[PDB]
Design a binder for this molecule. Structure first.
Ligand code: DTP
Ligand code: DTP
Ligand code: MG
Ligand code: MG
Lengths: 545, 544
């Protein structure tokens, strides 16, 4: 109970009551206290703050940032480039109410391994006068480390120059892990890597994979940052691929430290038509994600990219409450036919909730978000510091959620989708109907809408605690607490690894906002999980304990 | 208009009235709503947070800190030491409502220059097989940079190994200055000047040369606030060891208006256990922050400033009483009414400080991570829930005033820059407060002091309400922006010597804080410091 916690707690409790009675609609706020819709991050509504963003780190490292009275200059070393990444992540956090992500962590910091190598290559000609003017552009397969025991030539001062760069990058990544793990006040951070096939890129991947195995402190396991591995055929999946070595190392780390996660880049819906293996800027047309299971890929009025975009707001739905309210009728054809009428009126209600906040997030000032509306958003750099930022906000995304499929799969047929085949077919109808209605609203409201599988990181037992107080204790529904996740097989049901994958697989295509796959337990038991993610279309996956 | 600027505004607006109506006493609330006492940091009352502290960095840097789920290990390089210092100064800011100060900056960071130099030596023996096992304990006069154009043997490796340490320390100090200046969405101070070893001088020079280049495209920085410590026998006279750094500091202040100056002789900053050969002599030396705060003596402990600090302080309005005392014709009666109107308010302020002290106790050692574990004098002897009560008694409490010149014109008609009768009456209103502070310290069993408030959040609060109540009075309520504690008015044409002579005597009486302010080559700065030494000053600042 620090003073910082007691200050934000007061702020949170004095802002939500004002939001409900002065900033919402009588039609929408009616369902926000009736166990139908949960408006995420309601305490930050009066501040016109967006949720999360993928940082375009190339615009800050090349030309410095000038926020407030603090002015910086272009970086020239690995040490100063890694720190500026933390500064950007810790500064934009005070302007947005969600998480911060770095897409293409390998791509972004790759050039500054080269610059730090040229600095050493001219601090060794000072002691030893030599015209070493060719190591600037010398191709290097990778930067490796080995004993300097036996060498009597230029290589002994060449391999040593590589030898001291890895440690100067080794400490730079160890400081990155500790610095993002020391939350003093009261910071959610995520990094994705794996798709860069160069010497500079591969140096970053190994040196942060070996610092998440030793741990923080006296051997403790770190919690932040959240690390994600990007898997693509032809690069790092098959044994013949270039980065197969670094794929078989991340599975060893996950067997003792439970990181990183795995992102399936084939996925039949993560593909793009302007991705080439020879493009220096090919990282634009690749999917990146955060630890909150958020996807921002497509665009109805722009190019298909994820950099410099993000989420604006999202809300969660209670599909269990509708199903429980539909009991009593005997015939099964009418209970199911009444469920979809109770879902149409809440999807339309949710859609107006997002639009009413889109207008409020408009008419803002670019100076309310320093370092965001000047360097981080797509349409910035074309606005005076006060000119009503409106022509850059249309590229964001809006989300609609749901929770508790298994419980609503036992309120109409009696058995959930882990012990019945009739229960699995009805599960794809209660989801594919929601996906279709998002396209109608996006054309109607002139925006981007999507369907989300909510992480339930702040909604663990809010719905079931109040559902018990209304209807009672119903066997199999309100008798366990802790509603199951989006569509997962219940944790109290004995199921094998394979049978769990065949059931949760089809739903990932329908939900374009986010999804995950969880397995609870040698690295062989970890690679077999990733194999299940290729035999079917998965997208995201995680193994923990 | 940032969201973090609206959330904090909401928190303050919803927290202050609750403090007013459900946490104070009636006798103190009545005065706090009646332009007599202003309570500093009123919005942070319900959180049992203290104000400021001087960080003992040695315990953190020797054995690492474990706050929350983050665990750190002992440092081994200059970069890690500086980053750990920044982390400590940024973490404790979330547990206290005031500023953070680092005393003995050079003393604290000296050994890690040696550690980095040893690392460089052992890295340079790697390339060329040579037994350089004696440079670990080789005395060095100082670490200086020079060209390497022309030399050979076992000296261009052991002078260039020292020529790369200076760059590493230089970049470390530049990163420190820039990181303490970035506004994410923090008030910090560092004190240095008294260490005479090679490493301390290296650190002092490498930060003084960077507070001149500026931040960004050669722009003047604002943070951290830097303070220079001046002592006879070390860095004042031309014969002294650190005279060159003193002249360099004057040159930097001549164009960037930093650092300030702290007079260590002062007749009241002296200590009886300070020796020139003590490795721990920095304990018995005065340190200050940018908010004019002094924590030196102790009625129930040793005389030091490390690991101590302030708990709360409040400001008084002596102008209101003097304005209220007008109308009577004779001067003796008007003067005698003033001290009567002052005594009761002094007692009220003492009671308020004591009651807030009583509330601040009964806290938990787990409400201030790393503070009640590594940063206080009596910590490291408490279980994480043992209700700290035996470590809080070493803090301090503060009573302040504002507007001496205006109260000097409500009784006699002239302020203490145009009369000698008005200068004698200004040395009574402060000595009475000092005597009453000693009496209350004897009574309430605490430590109390008198302060000259910085007026960083009280600039025009009092004058508007006084104008609304009494009217417009020529010379009193006609100028806006009440003068500072005891300074000569800015609208009076005065030289520097006369201002120094007028303002000098008050610094001994005010043991909480004070400053001497001058508005414009290092010749002028040297003259200001000479004026400070000629009388007893303690603290001074020159800036345009
Ligand atoms: N920015 C940071 N914030 C918090 N802790 C940090 C930061 N940077 C480094 N640390 C931690 C990592 C270590 O536990 C500790 C000391 O770092 P360091 O000097 O590298 O020592 P070490 O013993 O880990 O190094 P070596 O690898 O040479 O043995 O400080
Ligand atoms: N910790 C930090 N926090 C914020 N800004 C920082 C930090 N460290 C460095 N900076 C800023 C200030 C510098 O002007 C800028 C560039 O750093 P740096 O790599 O030292 O470039 P430079 O051009 O000053 O170096 P050089 O001394 O080689 O000329 O980064
Ligand atoms: Mg280390
Ligand atoms: Mg630099």
């Amino acid at each position: 109970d620090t003073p910082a916690g007691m200050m934000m707690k007061f702020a949170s409790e004095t802002t939500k009551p004002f939001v409900d009675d002065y900033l919402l609609s009588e039609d929408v706020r009616d369902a926000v206290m009736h166990n139908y819709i949960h408006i995420h991050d309601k305490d930050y509504y009066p501040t016109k703050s967006l949720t999360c963003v993928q940082h375009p780190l190339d615009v800050i490292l090349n030309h410095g940032f000038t926020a407030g009275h603090g002015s910086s200059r272009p970086a020239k070393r690995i040490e100063t480039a890694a720190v500026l990444a933390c500064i950007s992540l810790e500064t934009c956090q005070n302007e947005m109410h969600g998480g911060q992500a770095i897409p293409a962590f390998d791509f972004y910091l790759a050039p500054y391994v080269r610059m730090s190598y040229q600095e050493e290559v001219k601090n060794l000609e000072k002691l030893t006068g030599e015209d070493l003017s060719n190591l600037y552009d010398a191709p290097i397969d990778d930067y490796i480390e080995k004993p300097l025991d036996g060498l009597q030539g230029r290589e002994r001062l060449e391999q040593h120059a590589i030898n001291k760069t890895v440690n100067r990058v080794h400490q730079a990544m160890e400081a990155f892990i500790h610095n993002m793990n020391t939350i003093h006040s009261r910071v959610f951070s995520s990094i994705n890597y794996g798709t860069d096939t160069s010497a500079e890129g591969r140096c970053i991947m190994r040196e942060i994979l070996q610092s998440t195995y030793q741990g923080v402190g006296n051997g403790e396991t770190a919690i932040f940052p959240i690390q994600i591995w990007k898997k693509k055929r032809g690069v790092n999946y098959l044994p013949e691929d270039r980065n197969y070595d670094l794929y078989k190392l991340a599975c060893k780390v996950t067997a003792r430290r439970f990181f990183p996660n795995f992102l399936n880049l084939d996925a039949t819906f993560n593909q793009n038509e302007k991705w080439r293996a020879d493009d220096p800027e090919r990282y634009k047309w690749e999917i990146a994600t955060m630890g909150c299971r958020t996807r921002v890929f497509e665009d109805r009025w722009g190019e298909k990219t994820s950099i410099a975009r993000g989420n604006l707001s999202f809300s969660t739905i209670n599909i269990v409450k509708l199903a429980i309210e539909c009991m009593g009728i005997e015939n099964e054809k009418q209970r199911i036919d009444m469920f979809f009428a109770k879902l149409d009126n809440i999807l339309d209600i949710t859609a107006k909730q997002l639009d009413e906040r889109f207008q409020f997030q408009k008419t803002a000032m670019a100076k309310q978000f320093p370092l965001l509306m000047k360097y981080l958003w797509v349409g910035a750099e074309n606005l005076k510091p006060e000119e009503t930022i409106e022509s850059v906000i249309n590229h964001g995304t809006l989300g609609i959620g749901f929770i508790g499929l298994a419980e609503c799969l036992v309120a109409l047929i009696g058995k959930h989708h882990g012990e019945s085949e009739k229960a699995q077919e009805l599960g794809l109808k209660i989801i594919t109907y929601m996906r279709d209605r998002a396209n109608e609203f996006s054309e109607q409201y002139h925006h981007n809408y999507s369907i989300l599988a909510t992480p339930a990181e702040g909604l663990s037992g809010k719905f079931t605690k109040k559902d018990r107080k209304q209807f009672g204790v119903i066997p199999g529904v309100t008798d366990r607490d802790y509603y199951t996740n989006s569509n997962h097989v219940p944790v109290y049901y004995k199921c094998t690894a394979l049978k769990k994958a065949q059931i949760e697989a089809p739903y990932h295509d329908l939900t374009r906002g986010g999804h995950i796959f969880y397995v609870e337990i040698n690295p062989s038991v970890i690679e077999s999980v990733v194999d299940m993610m290729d035999k079917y279309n998965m997208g995201y996956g995680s193994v923990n304990h």
